[model samples]
Target: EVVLLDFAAAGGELGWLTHPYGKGWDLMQNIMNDMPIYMYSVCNVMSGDQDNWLRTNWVYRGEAERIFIELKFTVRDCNSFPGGASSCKETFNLYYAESDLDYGTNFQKRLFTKIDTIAPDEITVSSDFEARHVKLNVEERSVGPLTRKGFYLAFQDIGACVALLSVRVYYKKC
Candidate 1:
């Protein structure tokens, strides 16, 4: 297998195309001890009441059969402060769509299908921040095939504060 797409927050190249709802989302950069750290915040710690998401550009992986997705992120719990507490859980949804069209204008036209609901037990407790890693096999979820030779993925927040560090898409040679 080979990595088809590699997106890192600190790389300066935004892997995601747009944020449809556009609320409570930010691409943030922080200097921690003179070192710059970049993170794409799907939902900030304060605003976890609504749905927030980040949609990726159409990724083309010609002639590839199976797809693998790897995600690195941090989830923070806001229960330390009163009225600022969110339902701080590490649960989220990963949605994907296989299409030849690049649905640039209308993201809704992509017809995204939920691949899976990921809820890791490691980050469930209330804490400052918990980092987690997830690896997914696209075909195992019965998501069919990448017939169109292209696909799009979306990382959606299900009422928690999330900061994405990196995303990688891989595929095996047919």
Candidate 2:
């Protein structure tokens, strides 16, 4: 079972939050993040102290000079999508928020998501979203370290595994 997030609205309290769905049950987990700069909410879900399904991983050891998130994604489908999944090549909006809402942790251009297509059911999406200085909402873009919750992806069609795939994220000294 996927992890569940601990939500609260009062501030620094884990009580309950108004469900995003009409059923009053958090069903957004069924959706996917396909935005340019995926918006994430740490206070809500997607990557709080509970569940982190939206977080893609990267591969690296220590730190590096500069950083650029690497992604490798693909679509895996049998009858759902014949040609598998297509990136759709749409301009999406990505958003993310610090877990503890602590901007004191520095990062710039520290966020990235790389996707690639390998085979029919083999895909990947790597990310390196370590922003030192908070990037604003280009179009309600940057989201927040406060008001919002986990990561959010708003592309036309992306952030889904038709058949199967993998995504990794890594951070190096910049």
Candidate 3:
């Protein structure tokens, strides 16, 4: 089962890395990144906000691990657009990674998908999701060291307004 990492609204450590450069990023950099990455329900982002990052901390046990994550939101024309975008639909994308692993440096990232625009109160295209398996090779030496795994959500408001609802990730440990 996935857990709530950054939904609290408080800016804290969500424990995730986008790329290797992200892993090496100093605390000062982390703080700066933390803002855009850690989006809370209380903190509603204005339109035009892009490259924003949000993350979660998950535990993988046993050998079989599965994770299913999707964003649900209602898009509305902001009374006042934050960025210089028109009152139109927005695009939001999410990235998944592990903490300290770094994106391209230590590890590579697999693109989930990009959400171009969505209607208000209507679930985007994703109606339901199947669990993702956290596959691990028993022969891999790294498997023994995996104590904590990190999940990151990267959001980008391409159009005028993009809002996100509940995000859930389900995984098992082997």
Candidate 4:
């Protein structure tokens, strides 16, 4: 079993840090990231427009001890071109620390990976996405007096256009 830590569903503090960061991000306006429903959908990212990227952070109360934490999410290619000389594919980075105070300075890097292997829907199956989901799992994490963790997502390809169908952070409280 996995613990759903999404603020939209789990009910917690959700924050965002990124360039051209503006309104609405201060709260989880979209419920799609809370869980994988596909019908409701989540955040649609136009990597081609604005900054062409998305970065977010989730904070939680140190209620339970954690050992293994994994980010469960799916990416749908919305007119995105992958495997090119220079293209932006769905990439994710996870960081955690012991204290939530000034934690941004001490966020520890747990894992980082590129999700370019999954073909965007615009190319093959735009409606049926039974084979384009990506999952990132990390182990041996840390938490200060207050249990808090932050997650970052960015489309490396400058001209890439994609949409995040759903996102959920799962972990083992040990």
* Top of the candidates by TM-score: 1
lDDT, candidate 3, residue 116? 29
Candidate 1 lDDT, 31-127, residue by residue in tens: 6446676667754445536566677878886877678887766554445445664555456778988887787756772488888886543442343
Kindly report which residue stretches of model 3 are placed more than 4 angstroms away from their true locations once superposed: 1-50, 57-64, 77-88, 99-149, 172-174
Instruction: Supply the TM-score for candidate 3.
Output: 0.38
TM-score per model over all chains: 0.75, 0.23, 0.38, 0.38
Instruction: Give the top-scoring candidate (lDDT).
Output: 1
lDDT of 4 by residue, 18-97 (tens): 43344212233333346433211123243333332234354454455443333333444434333331433343333343
TM-score of 1: 0.75
Off by over 4 Å in 1: 31-37, 44-49, 84-89, 124-144
Candidate lDDT values, in order: 0.63, 0.24, 0.35, 0.36
What does candidate 3's lDDT look like per residue over 1-174, in tens digits? Answer: 433332324343443333223321122212222344232321233334333343333333333234444454444344334453343443344444444343432332354333223234432222222332211111100112223344344444334233343344444344
Clashes of each: 0, 55, 17, 5
RMSD of each: 4.8, 16.5, 12.9, 8.2
Candidates 2 and 4 compared by lDDT, better number: 4
Q: Rank the candidates by lDDT, best first.
A: 1, 4, 3, 2
lDDT of 2 by residue, 1-174 (tens): 111221211122321121222221121221233422222232121121221123221112222222222222333222233343342221222323233222222322244232322232232222212322221211111111123222312111233332111112222332
